[PDB]
Design an enzyme around this catalytic site. Sequence first.
Site, PDB file in Angstrom:
ATOM      1  N   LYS A  73      -6.873   1.725  -3.269  1.00  0.00           N
ATOM      2  CA  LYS A  73      -6.801   1.120  -2.178  1.00  0.00           C
ATOM      3  C   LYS A  73      -6.810   2.178  -1.032  1.00  0.00           C
ATOM      4  O   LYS A  73      -7.184   2.126  -0.114  1.00  0.00           O
ATOM      5  CB  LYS A  73      -5.345   0.642  -2.195  1.00  0.00           C
ATOM      6  CG  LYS A  73      -4.744   0.011  -0.711  1.00  0.00           C
ATOM      7  CD  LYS A  73      -5.529  -1.093  -0.113  1.00  0.00           C
ATOM      8  CE  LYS A  73      -5.088  -1.462   1.238  1.00  0.00           C
ATOM      9  NZ  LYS A  73      -5.835  -2.245   1.720  1.00  0.00           N
ATOM     10  N   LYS A 110      -0.504   5.367   8.196  1.00  0.00           N
ATOM     11  CA  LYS A 110       0.161   5.578   7.190  1.00  0.00           C
ATOM     12  C   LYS A 110      -0.873   5.706   5.872  1.00  0.00           C
ATOM     13  O   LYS A 110      -0.622   6.309   5.179  1.00  0.00           O
ATOM     14  CB  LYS A 110       1.278   4.381   6.938  1.00  0.00           C
ATOM     15  CG  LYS A 110       2.107   4.630   5.573  1.00  0.00           C
ATOM     16  CD  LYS A 110       1.325   3.644   4.409  1.00  0.00           C
ATOM     17  CE  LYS A 110       1.473   2.212   5.069  1.00  0.00           C
ATOM     18  NZ  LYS A 110       0.852   1.271   3.721  1.00  0.00           N
ATOM     19  N   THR A 153       0.906  -1.235  -0.028  1.00  0.00           N
ATOM     20  CA  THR A 153       0.006  -0.072  -0.021  1.00  0.00           C
ATOM     21  C   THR A 153       1.008   1.362   0.153  1.00  0.00           C
ATOM     22  O   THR A 153       1.597   1.575   0.921  1.00  0.00           O
ATOM     23  CB  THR A 153      -1.084   0.160   1.202  1.00  0.00           C
ATOM     24  OG1 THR A 153      -1.719  -1.108   1.298  1.00  0.00           O
ATOM     25  CG2 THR A 153      -1.955   1.127   1.268  1.00  0.00           C
TER      26      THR A 153
HETATM   27  N1  LIG Z   1      -1.949  -6.372   7.935  1.00  0.00           N
HETATM   28  C1  LIG Z   1      -2.806  -6.109   7.002  1.00  0.00           C
HETATM   29  O1  LIG Z   1      -4.272  -6.237   7.694  1.00  0.00           O
HETATM   30  C2  LIG Z   1      -3.085  -5.461   5.765  1.00  0.00           C
HETATM   31  C3  LIG Z   1      -3.928  -5.752   4.978  1.00  0.00           C
HETATM   32  C4  LIG Z   1      -4.062  -5.026   3.460  1.00  0.00           C
HETATM   33  C5  LIG Z   1      -2.801  -4.385   3.124  1.00  0.00           C
HETATM   34  N2  LIG Z   1      -1.642  -4.044   4.003  1.00  0.00           N
HETATM   35  C6  LIG Z   1      -0.452  -3.686   3.722  1.00  0.00           C
HETATM   36  O2  LIG Z   1       0.431  -4.544   3.171  1.00  0.00           O
HETATM   37  C7  LIG Z   1       1.657  -3.768   3.334  1.00  0.00           C
HETATM   38  C8  LIG Z   1       2.725  -4.936   4.324  1.00  0.00           C
HETATM   39  O3  LIG Z   1       2.256  -4.931   5.646  1.00  0.00           O
HETATM   40  P1  LIG Z   1       1.928  -5.969   6.919  1.00  0.00           P
HETATM   41  O4  LIG Z   1       0.728  -5.692   7.107  1.00  0.00           O
HETATM   42  O5  LIG Z   1       2.561  -7.272   6.374  1.00  0.00           O
HETATM   43  O6  LIG Z   1       2.919  -5.196   7.793  1.00  0.00           O
HETATM   44  P2  LIG Z   1       4.274  -5.845   8.489  1.00  0.00           P
HETATM   45  O7  LIG Z   1       4.027  -7.105   9.188  1.00  0.00           O
HETATM   46  O8  LIG Z   1       4.676  -4.777   9.407  1.00  0.00           O
HETATM   47  O9  LIG Z   1       5.467  -6.050   7.479  1.00  0.00           O
HETATM   48  C9  LIG Z   1       6.023  -5.102   6.730  1.00  0.00           C
HETATM   49  C10 LIG Z   1       6.994  -5.730   5.753  1.00  0.00           C
HETATM   50  O10 LIG Z   1       7.767  -4.380   5.131  1.00  0.00           O
HETATM   51  C11 LIG Z   1       9.236  -4.797   5.216  1.00  0.00           C
HETATM   52  N3  LIG Z   1       9.902  -3.418   5.436  1.00  0.00           N
HETATM   53  C12 LIG Z   1       9.697  -2.322   6.111  1.00  0.00           C
HETATM   54  N4  LIG Z   1      10.733  -1.418   5.773  1.00  0.00           N
HETATM   55  C13 LIG Z   1      11.638  -1.865   4.909  1.00  0.00           C
HETATM   56  C14 LIG Z   1      12.641  -1.325   4.454  1.00  0.00           C
HETATM   57  N5  LIG Z   1      13.237  -0.186   4.817  1.00  0.00           N
HETATM   58  N6  LIG Z   1      13.415  -2.335   3.426  1.00  0.00           N
HETATM   59  C15 LIG Z   1      12.975  -3.526   3.357  1.00  0.00           C
HETATM   60  N7  LIG Z   1      11.749  -4.064   3.872  1.00  0.00           N
HETATM   61  C16 LIG Z   1      11.046  -3.041   4.756  1.00  0.00           C
HETATM   62  C17 LIG Z   1       9.146  -5.388   6.541  1.00  0.00           C
HETATM   63  O11 LIG Z   1      10.488  -6.046   6.862  1.00  0.00           O
HETATM   64  P3  LIG Z   1      11.000  -6.693   8.283  1.00  0.00           P
HETATM   65  O12 LIG Z   1      10.423  -7.944   8.373  1.00  0.00           O
HETATM   66  O13 LIG Z   1      12.665  -6.605   8.026  1.00  0.00           O
HETATM   67  O14 LIG Z   1      10.725  -5.588   9.213  1.00  0.00           O
HETATM   68  C18 LIG Z   1       8.176  -6.314   6.540  1.00  0.00           C
HETATM   69  O15 LIG Z   1       8.516  -7.513   5.681  1.00  0.00           O
HETATM   70  C19 LIG Z   1       1.575  -2.666   4.034  1.00  0.00           C
HETATM   71  O16 LIG Z   1       1.671  -2.089   2.928  1.00  0.00           O
HETATM   72  C20 LIG Z   1       0.192  -2.743   4.680  1.00  0.00           C
HETATM   73  O17 LIG Z   1      -0.435  -1.529   4.663  1.00  0.00           O
HETATM   74  C21 LIG Z   1      -1.749  -4.786   5.315  1.00  0.00           C
END
Ligand SMILES: NC(=O)c1ccc[n+]([C@@H]2O[C@H](COP(=O)([O-])OP(=O)(O)OC[C@H]3O[C@@H](n4cnc5c(N)ncnc54)[C@H](OP(=O)(O)O)[C@@H]3O)[C@@H](O)[C@H]2O)c1
Lengths: 287, 286, 287, 287
Positions: D171, D239, D96
């Site tokens: 989104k 965010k 996102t």
């Molecule tokens: N959770 C939900 O319900 C949901 C639903 C739909 C969409 N989303 C979106 O999906 C995306 C992933 O989020 P998530 O929910 O899976 O969150 P998350 O568990 O916090 O995962 C974030 C990911 O981003 C990586 N990352 C962050 N900064 C980075 C950097 N500077 N360089 C390389 N990798 C980096 C993290 O790596 P590390 O493991 O090394 O920290 C982790 O793999 C986000 O955009 C979120 O908004 C989330």
Amino acid sequence: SQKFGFIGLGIMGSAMAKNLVKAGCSVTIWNRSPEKAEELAALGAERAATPCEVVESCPVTFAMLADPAAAEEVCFGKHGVLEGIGEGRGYVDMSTVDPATSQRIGVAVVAKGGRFLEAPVSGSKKPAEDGTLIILAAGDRNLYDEAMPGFEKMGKKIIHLGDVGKGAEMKLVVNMVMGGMMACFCEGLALGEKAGLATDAILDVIGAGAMANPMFALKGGLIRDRNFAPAFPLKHMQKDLRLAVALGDRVGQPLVASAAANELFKGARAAGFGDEDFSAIFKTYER
Amino acid sequence: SQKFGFIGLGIMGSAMAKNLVKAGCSVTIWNRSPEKAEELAALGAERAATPCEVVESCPVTFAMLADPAAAEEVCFGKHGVLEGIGEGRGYVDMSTVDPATSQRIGVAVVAKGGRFLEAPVSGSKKPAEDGTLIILAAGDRNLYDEAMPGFEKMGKKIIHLGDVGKGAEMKLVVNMVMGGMMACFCEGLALGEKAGLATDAILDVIGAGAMANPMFALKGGLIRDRNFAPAFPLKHMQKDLRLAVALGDRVGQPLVASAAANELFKGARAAGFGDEDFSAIFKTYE
Amino acid sequence: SQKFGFIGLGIMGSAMAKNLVKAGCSVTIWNRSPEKAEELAALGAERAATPCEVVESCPVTFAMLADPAAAEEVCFGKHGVLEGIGEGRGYVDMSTVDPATSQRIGVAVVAKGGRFLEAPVSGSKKPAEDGTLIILAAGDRNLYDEAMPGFEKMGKKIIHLGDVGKGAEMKLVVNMVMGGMMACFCEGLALGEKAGLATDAILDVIGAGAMANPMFALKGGLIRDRNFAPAFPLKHMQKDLRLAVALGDRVGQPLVASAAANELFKGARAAGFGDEDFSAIFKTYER
Amino acid sequence: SQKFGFIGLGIMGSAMAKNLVKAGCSVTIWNRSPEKAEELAALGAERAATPCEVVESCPVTFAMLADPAAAEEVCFGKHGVLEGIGEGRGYVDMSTVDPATSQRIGVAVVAKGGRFLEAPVSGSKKPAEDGTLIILAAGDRNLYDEAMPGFEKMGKKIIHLGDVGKGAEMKLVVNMVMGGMMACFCEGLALGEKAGLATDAILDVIGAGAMANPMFALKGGLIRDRNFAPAFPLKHMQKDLRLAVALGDRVGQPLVASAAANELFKGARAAGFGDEDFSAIFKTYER
Ligand SMILES: NC(=O)c1ccc[n+]([C@@H]2O[C@H](COP(=O)([O-])OP(=O)(O)OC[C@H]3O[C@@H](n4cnc5c(N)ncnc54)[C@H](OP(=O)(O)O)[C@@H]3O)[C@@H](O)[C@H]2O)c1
Ligand SMILES: NC(=O)c1ccc[n+]([C@@H]2O[C@H](COP(=O)([O-])OP(=O)(O)OC[C@H]3O[C@@H](n4cnc5c(N)ncnc54)[C@H](OP(=O)(O)O)[C@@H]3O)[C@@H](O)[C@H]2O)c1
Ligand SMILES: NC(=O)c1ccc[n+]([C@@H]2O[C@H](COP(=O)([O-])OP(=O)(O)OC[C@H]3O[C@@H](n4cnc5c(N)ncnc54)[C@H](OP(=O)(O)O)[C@@H]3O)[C@@H](O)[C@H]2O)c1
Ligand SMILES: NC(=O)c1ccc[n+]([C@@H]2O[C@H](COP(=O)([O-])OP(=O)(O)OC[C@H]3O[C@@H](n4cnc5c(N)ncnc54)[C@H](OP(=O)(O)O)[C@@H]3O)[C@@H](O)[C@H]2O)c1
């Protein structure tokens, strides 16, 4: 040797009554909680048992109460203003209230044979002590003229805005802006703190620019020193924004920023800063 | 005579550069739109073709650009400041911009072997014309000293807030407060109007009390007269609130009130008032 | 045959009263504007000249009025409910009102020998026609039980929340959420359209996901149709948010988002959409 | 049989990648923190040293990263996607992110001779685990068709919205509404609690009416239980609101309600709830 009644001896009312006493007036006094009355009695004020007693024996009585509930209770309750007022004697409510409340009191006063003026003020504890309040009167013209020497010992600038309600409206408008300014000013100081700016540096820049005002100067330093002793009690600022929002509702004016300010001050009350200065809202931002 | 470059000749930059020329500096100027550079040329200023040319030619160059996008394009763009900077020549960016932006520009300038100072200002069109601006410098101390003869002709109060980024944070903080004040002042004036009060009555009460300030006094009178000729363009005020709110986002500070003011100024932009004075937000409450 | 009275024949009341008549009940009715009574009149409903007349002649009377002012007028006013009730006859106010006025009305009715029950409802024009309203009653438990045959023809889910005031509190809480939902929904649609997204595509994505609900499905469709015929009048939604903010003020809950929604709905009224459906707020975000 | 790359093994990515692995795909994976790859590795997935390595060796690679800064670092940084993509291999960024970020990435990818598709998703941890996501793709149609067998193991509804940027915009719009509605929902539960209503009663009335939705139903229960284990991290909700407000700024759409929700979510981050579920915003409403 003019005689005045004074009802409501809080932060504002206490200092105002004292100015009438210092000026040489004979003053008859009443407060729900006896202690504050006993303070002025010692200074030479005459202490009355009930509101009824005050307006029963004074040609002109000023009132300085918390809010509409207080103002209405003192007016309509047992041994209230309505019971003692009459035969041309004047009631001057200087409490910040909504125009509907002052109008309501005015009518009832006039039905009892009295005269009524509303005269909310601008300026806080220090201006109250210094006798430099701005007085926003509306209502009976003859009572305005008659109360003038009293007004002149409490304020520096004294105006008449017309029919009962216009004074409340002016007060609410002015205070809505003040509440809003204070919310924004505190957001600036809190944001500055977190950005790593010194407060004095921020205060210095503001003081040099087009926004400079006495309120920012005063409250800025007080915030820096984290001193929130009440000058204008936060719970009263919130009441005022409450009333301003209801005025907006009634006249069809959306107030997005002022309504936000109302809610932020409610947050400050919930946090326990209700009896502190309204500048205590800074602590919710910080914290 | 003292040689200075000047980039960006809008409301502010135009008035500032004119002070440098008036004081007898030898000034080289550039603006994206060349008509804005014609007036200064006629006063003796030397027109360069690109920002790169101003900075090649001058020991110290000031810039007064609309926003971060503008500042970055002039710095990093083809024939921009970076292509011409070097040998310790100084770039003093006075645009109102976020900390990350001025820091990024300074790093790049220093890397090219130049010196960088940020110096946003407080005070509007009249202060710019009168040379009574407040100058909020941050960055290279030696470039600060070197620009001082210019600063003194453009402003009355000059300070240095520390490392690059501190000038921008101060500027954003104070303008955020100003934007909120304007928003609330205007809600009050519109509320009072609808309640049936006289605009002059409200103004007088406010002018007599603890809130009284030069901004309310000047803007109040112009609102009463429905005169919204741009001194501080509404679009730039909104930009500043945007940046302030982003800063709040970065340092973990909620800004409920200032965010509301941001959206209200966006409303004014959408209503078509972006090029008028920021006091024109009043018309949206009307 | 079962006999009920009915007061207030707007969008809701007329539909609800129609259901009682259709169920076979003898219904006595009244509306400030007598023209609105004409349709039910043809249906067999007997027309009364005054609210007093309705509560004089019926064991249980329902009321469905605009706002606290209207409910207060009909109750305390000349030829109002108060002049008519007594001898145990029940008054059921289903108007959306603040806890204090429903309590004030209850005490007044009860001190007159009558019984009082509040029962604000959730569900708009179609649920009112269909008899699928949610009934949030509070107050005289005995009146509740006698009212049931009537409730059961007007709504599908009927509950008792305790003392008078609890019904109103539940109703305001729920509508506050609804108002805030509608405001956020419309911001999204308008933002989407300004970004160049097709709003039917947006509606499909929302409909497919976790926040999908009947309100968004229907109101989304209507917005797309540009059909803002009132089901829930916008002016009434604004009133409810006003009351929700006052409740927040009173119980010490800051309501930042809800207060914002209140102001946005005020803007919609200022723009001339007060008598359109509350979804008309969408038009303020646009064009 | 299919070979896929996967970059970003957070809450969503790890669950999405597992579904590709469970489906019998040959999957090469990478995460900034390599321990999050361990479970997939034991499931047969192949470890890549760098993002560049993944995109060197896979025909289509999916990315599921935190925010625009992450998405850009992975694309443009050392050992990044751009160092490794080419010869028509595809990069599908499902993070996102704002429209301008995804367009930026896509343009740089195309310049290296690769193909690009953005495909952010709707649906949280449970739907990611179940393979039940809604996939909002935009960009290269041939890549869309090529990635479909993978999309089909990760989601249930898969759509194509046009050029790069349309997916991001959809989104952001949809999440903005979801964020505001969570904020409003929580204000309602907190208000109700302070008014002395039981939360189960509030939940039950909402679930019966037109606002009922799976989100309120799921989150309402977990709030009642004070269980805020992260499904959608609160910092990410905030965010998204940040990005939606910036979209509003860019396309000329004032977003009063949504900007308020943004500030409230910021407040929740400041209280330390950034890594709990976004429903944790409730805890800022009740001390
Ligand atoms: N959770 C939900 O319900 C949901 C639903 C739909 C969409 N989303 C979106 O999906 C995306 C992933 O989020 P998530 O929910 O899976 O969150 P998350 O568990 O916090 O995962 C974030 C990911 O981003 C990586 N990352 C962050 N900064 C980075 C950097 N500077 N360089 C390389 N990798 C980096 C993290 O790596 P590390 O493991 O090394 O920290 C982790 O793999 C986000 O955009 C979120 O908004 C989330
Ligand atoms: N403080 C300022 O800077 C300022 C400036 C302008 C206007 N005002 C307005 O002035 C008014 C008084 O303000 P303040 O700052 O003086 O307030 P304060 O210090 O809190 O005193 C409030 C006064 O109201 C009285 N009161 C409250 N409820 C009452 C009741 N039910 N019956 C009888 N008396 C009651 C209190 O009596 P007890 O002593 O028994 O509690 C006290 O005398 C308010 O309307 C305020 O908005 C204040
Ligand atoms: N006006 C005030 O009271 C005030 C006060 C303090 C600070 N400021 C700040 O001063 C700066 C200038 O404001 P202003 O009031 O002078 O604004 P202005 O009259 O609108 O002029 C802005 C200047 O920026 C230039 N510009 C915009 N985009 C550009 C781009 N992409 N590339 C190159 N140049 C670009 C314009 O060039 P063109 O002429 O070709 O369009 C113009 O010279 C802003 O940061 C503003 O916030 C303003
Ligand atoms: N519509 C909905 O989807 C919905 C859903 C649930 C609850 N509600 C609530 O139900 C109540 C009725 O709403 P509605 O939609 O039926 O409204 P409506 O169509 O606008 O009419 C409301 C009624 O109130 C009457 N009224 C207004 N002021 C009055 C006064 N001063 N004295 C006597 N009667 C007065 C009107 O009489 P006149 O005909 O003479 O104007 C009308 O009969 C409101 O509290 C509303 O908030 C509405």
